[PDB]
């Protein structure tokens with residue numbers, strides 16, 4: 169079986185990174201030890217194309233995805249398994265993958281905590297106006313009026329958690345001790361929790377001091393926070409989205425910041441990814457974006473390495489995956 | 500009473516302001532006092548002012564020279580905490596009361612420190628530079644990006660803020676350890692530990708101690724190097740606890756992966772303070788006393804003092820710097 173991987177390019181010195189072309193999350197030996205062919209693409213597109221005829225299994229991370237469009241899938245008569253090194257498979261045409269009977273699996277669980285940490289950090293950076301505080305530090309300055317102007321304690325604020333699954337809940341736990349009212353909305357998790365009051369969406373949107381997103385990208389969350397929803401959110405509120413870029417309307421969110429309806433936006437997830445160099449989210453007012461590594465913390469890497477490995481093991485001998493892990497099922 | 504306030508010009512829903520002036524306009528003229536907001540070339544005012552008010556980051560200086568000229572002044576209010584700007588000696592002798600608003604930012608400081616831990620370990624600074632910069636490395640940012648979870652965090656100084664920081668760190672599933680000269684029992688939350696051990700065993704250390712003669716320069720070149728490789732230091736206690744220049748050596752050599760905090764030697768930090776420019780800092784200037792609800796706190800306090808003064812009531816001693824006749 170021939171296994172193709174796309175990973176970020178290794179850089180001299182960065183001897184830590186697991187998920188790159190050099191250390192390639194341990195698969196070279198792991199694979200080449202089991203009789204299989206292993207191809208790491210430093211290519212993305214065009215060098216991808218020359219493997220489509222024969223790749224048995226494709227592998228990539230959401231942070232740096234090999235897009236499996238219908239176009240590409242149809243070219244891959246050998247392909248049986250698309251593994252997402254991480255969580256988030258929107259880089260794969262599920263519909264076509266389904267129709268060609270390719271399986272699609274990601275490593276559920278592997279980086280939930282990481283992402284929670286990143287989100288509460290974002291709350292803090294946003295409310296505390298860390299950005300201004302650090303700019304002034306860096307730029308020679310010392311001006312408390314202008315930092316002060318947007319600096320808030322997180323304490324006593326009301327936080328709305330949109331999507332109260334694994335990460336939503338991890339975020340509640342860590343936010344609870346900061347003395348803050350929690351509300352959440354989830355289709356299903358619609359009971360009060362020890363930590364959060366269930367609330368309608370309408371209500372989450374309008375009553376939250378800031379909102380953090382922990383919802384999947386489904387037909388309902390697709391472009392959910394458009395001009396209309398942003399509009400309905402409290403004036404001067406904040407928004408944190410480390411779930412998926414597309415939930416939040418690229419352009420609407422800009423107009424919301426520039427007009428100052430929204431006090432700030434942070435998160436680490438983009439449409440599309442990689443974020444093109446001129447993505448307006450990079451440059452826009454009062455942002456605390458980072459590039460997309462929150463679920464790619466170093467420790468997160470081991471967890472991913474170990475999942476991809478376990479998957480490939482089960483795959484190679486017809487052992488059935490944990491349901492956790494299956495996006496599209498295959499025979 | 501005629502009440503004078505110096506605040507900065509506006510520019511800004513800041514409260515300590517020529518525009519918002521912590522609400523003293525209507526508050527005062529609604530109980531019939533005169534209210535004058537301003538520059539310190541209103542000497543042209545101090546013959547007869549009953550009360551002066553200012554904030555510590557933009558003081559009206561009450562020099563002996565000016566106090567002698569100010570014979571009707573009964574109350575100097577500092578909108579905030581820190582009355583360096585008032586000659587207490589003279590205050591005392593001309594029986595002016597000097598009072599402060601003991602606005603209480605323990606929680607603020609704790610949040611700030613916890614955020615610094617996050618920014619440091621997760622590699623937010625690089626993560627954000629790449630963003631703004633239009634890059635998309637991933638080896639670069641991932642290379643030093645860590646979960647806070649599972650890390651051992653050492654708290655140097657287990658008073659209110661340390662404790663406040665513990666409670667917030669607890670649900671992140673880290674090992675907490677602390678050193679305290681007094682709370683040397685295990686805490687349901689942090690294991691007591693010797694300072695030696697704090698230094699050498701901690702993944703990141705946060706300083707929550709007071710500036711005493713034994714905390715002065717405690718984090719010098721020796722303790723910094725006794726700390727593990729690639730560890731992190733966060734200091735929102737006082738700048739001189741950490742040796743200004745040693746720490747720069749400690750980053751530059753990459754013994755320390757990171758340093759953040761909002762306290763400096765001296766403060767305000769000189770424009771060229773090396774901690775500004777040093778590698779892998781997450782320093783801010785020291786606002787925090789400065790948050791919007793720190794302003795509401797001050798607002799309410801300046802009001803409560805003025806109200807007390809007006810109805811001739813007693814004060815909290817915590818608020819009187821120089822006591823005086825009424826007071």
Ligand SMILES: NC(=O)c1ccc[n+]([C@@H]2O[C@H](COP(=O)([O-])OP(=O)(O)OC[C@H]3O[C@@H](n4cnc5c(N)ncnc54)[C@H](O)[C@@H]3O)[C@@H](O)[C@H]2O)c1
Nearest residue numbers: 255331333334335336354356382383384388410411462463
């Ligand atoms: N930044 C990263 O590196 C990274 C890593 C892991 C996960 N994530 C993202 O974070 C999100 C949260 O992941 P998780 O593990 O908590 O998944 P989860 O399944 O535990 O959480 C999703 C929850 O949202 C709810 N939900 C479903 N449809 C909804 C809708 N229309 N409106 C609101 N809520 C809805 C569901 O009830 C579900 O329980 C995921 O969608 C994932 O893509 C990103």
